């Protein structure tokens, strides 16, 4: 398993971004009712080469299972329309929307995505 730091709100994300100055960041958004999110955890975040590739990346995640007010505010703020979504931030805490992942990617596909599109590295 990869070690994700849980964030709940917009400003916990922002703070995490500020604290991560100089490092690449990755924000995974999941929910318990999300089938493809679990696929990601089981078949992709579990890959030995995927994990190596994220070794130096700050790992954040938001559990939006409850779809409460803070969850919805976070999703809006990030313009996230469905799950799974993964967002990527460079070393200045800026997002690179062109690196978003918005469906399941298998290990080989996600490796290639990180190699070809991951920011801040």
Residue numbers in the entry: 428 to 548
Question: What do the authors report?
Answer:
The transmembrane thiol:disulfide oxidoreductase DsbD is a three-domain protein responsible for shuttling electrons from the cytoplasm to the oxidizing periplasm of Gram-negative bacteria. Its central domain (tmDsbD) is located in the inner bacterial membrane and is flanked by two periplasmic globular domains (nDsbD, the N-terminal domain, and cDsbD, the C-terminal domain). cDsbD, like many proteins involved in periplasmic oxidative protein folding, adopts the more conventional Trx fold. Its role is very specific, to acquire reductant from tmDsbD and transfer it to nDsbD.
In this work we have found that replacing Gln-488 with an alanine residue, which cannot form a hydrogen bond or a salt bridge in the active site, has a dramatic effect on the pKa value of Cys-461. Despite the presence of reducing agent (TCEP) in the mother liquor, both proteins were found to be oxidized with a Cys-461–Cys-464 disulfide bond clearly present. The cysteine pair (Cys-461 and Cys-464), Asp-455, and Glu-468 of wild-type cDsbD overlay well with the same residues of Q488A-cDsbD. The only difference is that the side chain of Gln-488 is absent in Q488A-cDsbD and replaced by the much shorter alanine side chain. The carboxyl side chains of Asp-455 and Glu-468 in both wild-type and Q488A-cDsbD are oriented toward Cys-461 and remain in close proximity (<∼8 Å) to the N-terminal cysteine of the -CXXC- motif. The side chain solvent accessibilities of Asp-455 (9%) and Glu-468 (57%) in Q488A-cDsbD are comparable with those in wild-type cDsbD (7% for Asp-455 and 42% for Glu-468). In wild-type cDsbD, the hydrogen bond interaction with Gln-488 stabilizes the carboxylate group of Asp-455 and results in a pKa value of 5.8 or 6.7, depending on the oxidation state of the protein. In Q488A-cDsbD, the absence of this stabilizing interaction leads to a further elevation of the pKa value of Asp-455 to a point where it becomes indistinguishable from the pKa value of Cys-461. The phenomenon of microscopic pKa values occurs between Asp-455 and Cys-461 in Q488A-cDsbDred and, as a result, in a fraction of the protein molecule population Cys-461 has a pKa value of 7.6, which makes it significantly more reactive and prone to reoxidation compared with the wild-type domain. This was apparent when we measured the activity of this variant in the full-length protein in vivo; Q488A-DsbD was only ∼75% functional compared with wild-type-DsbD, consistent with part of the protein population being compromised.
